Design a protein around this ligand. Structure first.
Ligand code: RPB
Ligand code: RPB
Ligand code: RPB
Lengths: 147, 147, 147
């Protein structure tokens, strides 16, 4: 069915997105270590890498919203509505994280530790929020694969 | 000179390799954290990322040996021999690290934690050794460049 | 998760891996020809291609073990354990091939033809051994999929 096809694309997207989120977390941790150690060139590299993974998470989140809306058209279902709303909240959250990371990139580039530290802590806080939403989304998708 | 073009290609390779090494170090450190925390599936992902970066380091190390072999051929004397020997020792060390990572990856996949941990700790030690050789190579090449 | 998803991912992994193996064999054969004809720059290109494909085979072999390890946790029978054991031996063999290719690539870059030729012939012999295990693994999975 088209519903099975869409669900199969969604499972692949979310599997890929979780790997990318792991990469984003590792790059964020490495940036934090460089920052603590006063290694500004390492820090700049790790922020660029984090931003690369962040841009990829953002695109997976876009794809997930699109696919869940497509699912709702062919296979209306309480769970699909619920998933789409979580996915839309995640998309907003990851975009906010992207903006905050950009602020951290610019602050490091400008050598403004105070602006950097505030942005970087906000980035991590958004990551905790996004992680919760991603967990909620994953559970909703599991409940969708059992329908 | 063709020599100073070779030296230029070398500096570009080593710059690219250092970026990959920073990525490999972050992946290795994330793998260690996942291992400490008992996050088996996350550990697998970080080990796969490390393996991908490791293959890129190996390729750069091969290219560096090749470029220094080419530099030695344009020299009437043995000016480039020391750099070549250092680069060959770096390549040997990164390939040892790659073999050791293979052992660790297989052990983690096979659920053999004692073997995994021995190999993982050896991998980190080889990383410290390779880092020492890499910085030595960079200094030796700066000496071959006119400024 | 889910044995039917696991078996389907496994089939996809082995289909992809077989294509990569075919490409590895073509690169290996081109490297042998370049060696015999004395074209060392061609040999370098083919060895680099082989190294790339080998790293991909290694990754697919790891994935295969991990999938079959999952299958054995979900359906713990002798037939699952048998399939996993073949896949673990395949992974061991491909990682030995990888270590041997590393030796050959370093020898070719270091201009040590005697070591290169010995390691290259060992590489091919390990490839024929891995091919036997790969085909055995396919036959085992046919019993597991049951059409
Ligand atoms: C100690 N680790 C700090 C940390 C904690 C969380 C994250 C994280 N998790 C996410 C999940 C998710 F679905 C999306 C994002 C993230 C992050 C960094 C923020 N950005 C995300 O896109 C990054 C770093
Ligand atoms: C606390 N961080 C532990 C750690 C320390 C070092 C490395 C490292 N550094 C390298 C430099 C280098 F030139 C080559 C390699 C490495 C590593 C991991 C091993 N492999 C390398 O290729 C990885 C992890
Ligand atoms: C004349 N052809 C020589 C040749 C024969 C076999 C291979 C080969 N086959 C494999 C199967 C397999 F499952 C894994 C590997 C290989 C190879 C090169 C070794 N490496 C493999 O990973 C490469 C070259």
């Amino acid at each position: 069915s088209d519903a099975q096809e869409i669900l199969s694309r969604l499972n692949s997207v979310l599997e890929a997105a979780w790997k990318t989120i792991l990469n984003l977390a590792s790059a964020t941790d490495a940036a934090e270590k460089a920052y603590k150690e006063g290694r500004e060139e390492d820090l700049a590299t790790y922020l660029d890498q984090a931003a690369s993974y962040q841009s990829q998470v953002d695109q997976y989140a876009v794809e997930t919203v699109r696919l869940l809306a497509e699912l709702k058209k062919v296979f209306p279902d309480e769970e699909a509505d619920r998933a789409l709303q979580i996915a839309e909240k995640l998309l907003k959250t990851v975009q906010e994280a992207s903006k905050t990371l950009d602020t951290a990139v610019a602050a490091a580039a400008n050598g403004d530790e105070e602006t950097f530290a505030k942005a970087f802590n906000q980035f991590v806080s958004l990551g905790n929020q996004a992680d919760t939403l991603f967990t909620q989304l994953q559970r909703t998708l599991t409940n969708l694969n059992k329908k």
